Design an enzyme around this catalytic site. Structure first.
Site, PDB file in Angstrom:
ATOM      1  N   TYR A   1       0.824  -1.197   0.000  1.00 26.69           N
ATOM      2  CA  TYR A   1       0.000   0.000   0.000  1.00 26.69           C
ATOM      3  C   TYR A   1       0.869   1.263   0.000  1.00 26.69           C
ATOM      4  O   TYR A   1       1.857   1.369   0.737  1.00 26.69           O
ATOM      5  CB  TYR A   1      -0.928   0.003   1.218  1.00 26.69           C
TER       6      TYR A   1
ATOM      7  N   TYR B   1      -2.745   4.474   9.150  1.00 27.93           N
ATOM      8  CA  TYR B   1      -2.156   3.203   8.754  1.00 27.93           C
ATOM      9  C   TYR B   1      -0.957   3.050   9.672  1.00 27.93           C
ATOM     10  O   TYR B   1       0.166   3.400   9.302  1.00 27.93           O
ATOM     11  CB  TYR B   1      -1.704   3.268   7.303  1.00 27.93           C
TER      12      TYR B   1
END
Ligand SMILES: NC(=O)c1ccc[n+]([C@@H]2O[C@H](COP(=O)([O-])OP(=O)(O)OC[C@H]3O[C@@H](n4cnc5c(N)ncnc54)[C@H](O)[C@@H]3O)[C@@H](O)[C@H]2O)c1
Ligand SMILES: NC(=O)c1ccc[n+]([C@@H]2O[C@H](COP(=O)([O-])OP(=O)(O)OC[C@H]3O[C@@H](n4cnc5c(N)ncnc54)[C@H](O)[C@@H]3O)[C@@H](O)[C@H]2O)c1
Ligand SMILES: NC(=O)c1ccc[n+]([C@@H]2O[C@H](COP(=O)([O-])OP(=O)(O)OC[C@H]3O[C@@H](n4cnc5c(N)ncnc54)[C@H](O)[C@@H]3O)[C@@H](O)[C@H]2O)c1
Ligand SMILES: NC(=O)c1ccc[n+]([C@@H]2O[C@H](COP(=O)([O-])OP(=O)(O)OC[C@H]3O[C@@H](n4cnc5c(N)ncnc54)[C@H](O)[C@@H]3O)[C@@H](O)[C@H]2O)c1
Ligand SMILES: Nc1ccc(Oc2ccc(Cl)cc2O)c(Cl)c1
Ligand SMILES: Nc1ccc(Oc2ccc(Cl)cc2O)c(Cl)c1
Ligand SMILES: Nc1ccc(Oc2ccc(Cl)cc2O)c(Cl)c1
Ligand SMILES: Nc1ccc(Oc2ccc(Cl)cc2O)c(Cl)c1
Lengths: 289, 289, 289, 289
Positions: free
Chosen positions: C171, C181
């Site tokens: 990602y 995240y």
């Protein structure tokens, strides 16, 4: 019926040809945009059968070549054509070779298409290094090798089915200095990779068309041999097959099978990207030897 | 005696000025290259004292401005000057403003220098998006905003002491598509960042001179306000002060103190780099809000 | 016949499943490596024919699952399973689930396979933001999401024919910060991509095996909801579908058809690359609004 | 007065020392955080005035060491030291060397400091190449070279005045593969740079504290010889001095004067960046020869 326009070919020694071959495995019709100066000379080689062997696509098929027409990336519309080329020995027996003129031509003769390819470049002063390149030489490089990609997209989008796909070919010389790739080809490719992203947003938001570029590795094509810098091209290939992660010899059809995939729907979610098909040489830093 | 040539200024609202101020703290003499069209109008503002307050460098000093001469980045030598500008109302009362002419001028009057600055840009079609930008508009953008940096280095290296230092200013529009920064300014900056590396090898290997570029953030300068796209520039600044890692307001002297450092010996080991002085906005991806 | 071990599937809602679906279209034999925690329940739903309508491949095909094995990437060899996990309620029944034992098991029942898919990640503190992640969770994230690949590669490269291909998922939050995240995930993906480079080198030169990694956009997977920050995944899907060049819902099969391309000969000239499959989000800096 | 904790010095031959030297020129108070293994021996050589000629700052200055403390970045708090290390021969005498205890100790004897330098790394299997590195060593490398920073940041950010700056060292082998840099090191530096981004975000918005990382070229340090592959470090120094744009020996003080710039207000507009200080090597793709 899938029609792909491949702009930028002279023989069967370059990427466009490797591009066309791989696409044929998908039975896509191929239209070739050829630089006026070598058009007829190209057409001639074609008529004599010099490409017959070079056209026998793997899957027991001939390469269905819809057409091959004159094309010049440094001319947008018919009125940009100056008195010079107006007179230039060759141009004489040729017409409708401006970017918009071929678009209209292909669209009138065959109509909407769905795959576009920009496999062309030229830097008149490639032999001089950046620091010694003129404004004329440089801008000419950008005009021929960079802006054209934009001009092409502007006029060709109009005759493209929804969700078409465009690709161009670029060189890592753009991200890391590679001595001998001068006259603006570094600057040029740098911009062609940036404009890919910007066009990627416009074309995708407005028309929902995708555009990406392939960062190939060394290939002994006329342009590569014509560079001259035992030749720039021969040095890049030697180095590559020796240090690149993948020890094999890079084929045009290698970039071709990647172009094939990027010009399909099987990649619908990829756009504005620079894909390296260089056997991985681009990941290395200092060579073992 | 350190002489820095700063090419690209019009008022005291831009980066060049913020650059000059910070350098003065190091007592470096400053020579200003000004676009002919606003030279006298600039000189006038100067004579009336409109910059007196804007010149009081922190450390209780005035900004020692060695000189301010006319300068045009889209002209290399004296013979590239066409009949147009030859006649152009303003150019008339001005001479020796081609890149090589100022080099000779500064070198004759003051001699060798050791710090060079390229703080200038212009994209005549910035308001149109890439896809709608002409060849003239684009190439003109590259010529004014990209090639000039090269041309400047070619002619000025000759009058630079050993180990001098050069810097330019670029915009992240080059790496990630930022809508509204059109007419080729994305393409331009993309190339200007690439040519920085390539020039970095040449200038450093041959003359042992360094060159880098600063990737600044939003600044309400005449060029930024002149863009027009509540204005492109006002939107970039709003966004930045809201989402950039560093919550404060970005000052020209911010880029100035960084330029100061990169133009010194205290960075002798840095070259061909693109340094971001954008409060860190460039690291972000999706904004919190 | 091509055999592919997909280490990741834990239900049809993520990329793991999509990848499998697409590989089938090309007629490749799959082999799921399910995690013990969800192994019993997955087989269950599989027998009850629940995934039946989900194993729907447009071409009126029916997915071709070959084998389905328990698999925990935390353990390299059978000596690494600790006592507690060895005696856990979910693990007791199962066996040969270490990265080495599944590799032998696969090579014993079928021989050398030629396609390795890594579609797994874990980070106990994905919720907590980096600064407040513990050394324990951090090392756990990398051990789980980063190392897991390297070890799959070492042990599985001995049951993979030359020219076989490997891939993993990543990602963008590793290259650009996306608040939320955490738990060392960004760090983990930063390693996986670098490691993809190093591995693509050693694997290339030595085994003629390629390895790449796909940087996928957002998909609502079991794991994506785990992320608590309309949660994090719903903000990501929403932001994406509104700002990416391509404004269409990002399907898992889209990343799937791209994994399939990488996994085949088509991409024989690409290795060590992070290919973005995300409707172009990564090329954006500022937004439209 | 500016106080700077340099967590890394273990003798004058590396960047740790060079950084300290340079920070002194600017008159900042240093505070070494030495590793227990080499703590006793360092103090020794310090008292014997061996580093005397090494603490030589051109400006006829004499380095200004403020304090010198034992420090092990493996331990976050005092509860993390295990029994064995707690009772090791080199550690017994020492105390308060965890990342939390040195932070309090520093804040107790001097108060809030405003400059944090991280100049340490470790990887038990730096010798072995990635593929053959164990999960143990891998996690050890990151725990040591990657995490160590994040934890220094959490605990030290409470004794750092706003606008204070932090920095760390990294190597290009994370972005480009350099065979021989193994044991999870490439992976570790890949995390440190990503983490530098995430941290620069949280630290910015929250504490107005900046964090960056310098990507230094090769220097023959104690640690660089540890790397066994004329060893690895001597090939690197040789390759570099022959191919980097700037062909001058890369001093440690050069990275030092750059750490000093980052650590000061001069760079108040830069955060989350990986600034290369390496004579330009990173911009090269192919070589000259
Ligand atoms: N050979 C390599 O190793 C290599 C590597 C990376 C990228 N590329 C790129 O691949 C692309 C295709 O080149 P190739 O190397 O396969 O060689 P090629 O010789 O087949 O193609 C170059 C083409 O550019 C066209 N051209 C030049 N000026 C033009 C103009 N004004 N109008 C129209 N066409 C014009 C010519 O028709 C010519 O066919 C180029 O963009 C090149 O830079 C090549
Ligand atoms: N304002 C920002 O937020 C921002 C951000 C990133 C990069 N930059 C860059 O900073 C640099 C300086 O611009 P500024 O924004 O401080 O504005 P500015 O208005 O002070 O400077 C622009 C200058 O370009 C010069 N120029 C244009 N065409 C020329 C030509 N043919 N010959 C000579 N000079 C010419 C003009 O003299 C003018 O002073 C530019 O390159 C710009 O792109 C600015
Ligand atoms: N969903 C997204 O938007 C998104 C975006 C970018 C990258 N990715 C990546 O996609 C990949 C798959 O995730 P997904 O999002 O489809 O979710 P998912 O929940 O379907 O996949 C994760 C699977 O990995 C397995 N798993 C966890 N730890 C394991 C271990 N130690 N050993 C074996 N299996 C283990 C679980 O069974 C689970 O099914 C991951 O690598 C992830 O980082 C996902
Ligand atoms: N020498 C180079 O060519 C080079 C190149 C790129 C990056 N770097 C980086 O420079 C930094 C410093 O390394 P150097 O090369 O100058 O070597 P160095 O040997 O001087 O520095 C490493 C120091 O860190 C200390 N150390 C190791 N583990 C520790 C721990 N757990 N806690 C506290 N201290 C610990 C040791 O005392 C040692 O002095 C590192 O981050 C390294 O990755 C070095
Ligand atoms: N004037 C010119 C110069 C080089 C060209 O193509 C290339 C040939 C070899 C390499 Cl390595 C990279 C290239 O981009 C082309 Cl197609 C035209
Ligand atoms: N024609 C033109 C357009 C934009 C210019 O400067 C800039 C202004 C604002 C931003 Cl965000 C980025 C820039 O590069 C300059 Cl200096 C000239
Ligand atoms: N513990 C955990 C956390 C997140 C995970 O996958 C992802 C889910 C969503 C996004 Cl956006 C990016 C990812 O990498 C996975 Cl697979 C496991
Ligand atoms: N165990 C170990 C190995 C290498 C280390 O530092 C480095 C030494 C040389 C280079 Cl070229 C890059 C580095 O990051 C350090 Cl500091 C510790």
């Amino acid at each position: 019926e899938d029609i792909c326009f491949i702009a930028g070919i002279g023989d069967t020694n370059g990427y466009g040809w490797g591009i066309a071959k791989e696409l044929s495995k998908r039975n896509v019709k191929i239209i070739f945009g050829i630089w006026p100066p070598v058009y007829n000379i190209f057409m001639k080689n074609y008529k004599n059968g010099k490409f017959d062997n070079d056209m026998i696509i793997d899957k027991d098929k001939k390469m269905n070549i819809l057409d091959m027409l004159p094309f010049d990336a440094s001319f947008d519309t018919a009125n940009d054509i100056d008195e010079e080329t107006k007179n230039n020995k060759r141009y004489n027996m040729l017409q409708n070779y401006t970017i918009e003129d071929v678009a209209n031509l292909i669209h009138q003769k065959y109509g909407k298409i769905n795959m576009l390819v920009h496999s062309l470049a030229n830097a008149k002063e490639v032999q001089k290094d950046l620091l010694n390149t003129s404004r004329k030489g440089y801008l000419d490089a950008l005009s021929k090798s960079s802006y054209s990609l934009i001009s092409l997209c502007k006029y060709f989008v109009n005759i493209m089915k929804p969700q078409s796909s465009i690709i161009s070919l670029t060189y890592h010389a753009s991200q890391k200095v590679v001595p001998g790739y001068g006259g603006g080809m570094s600057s040029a490719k740098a911009a062609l990779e940036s404009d890919t992203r910007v066009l990627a947003y416009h074309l995708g938001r407005n028309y929902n068309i995708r555009i990406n570029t392939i960062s190939a590795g060394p290939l002994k094509s006329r342009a590569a041999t014509a560079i001259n810098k035992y030749t720039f091209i021969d040095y890049a290939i030697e180095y590559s097959e020796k240090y690149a992660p993948l020890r094999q010899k890079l084929l045009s059809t290698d970039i071709g099978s990647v172009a094939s995939f990027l010009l399909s729907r099987e990649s619908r979610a990829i756009t504005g990207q620079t894909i390296y098909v260089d056997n991985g040489l681009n990941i290395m830093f200092l060579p073992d030897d």
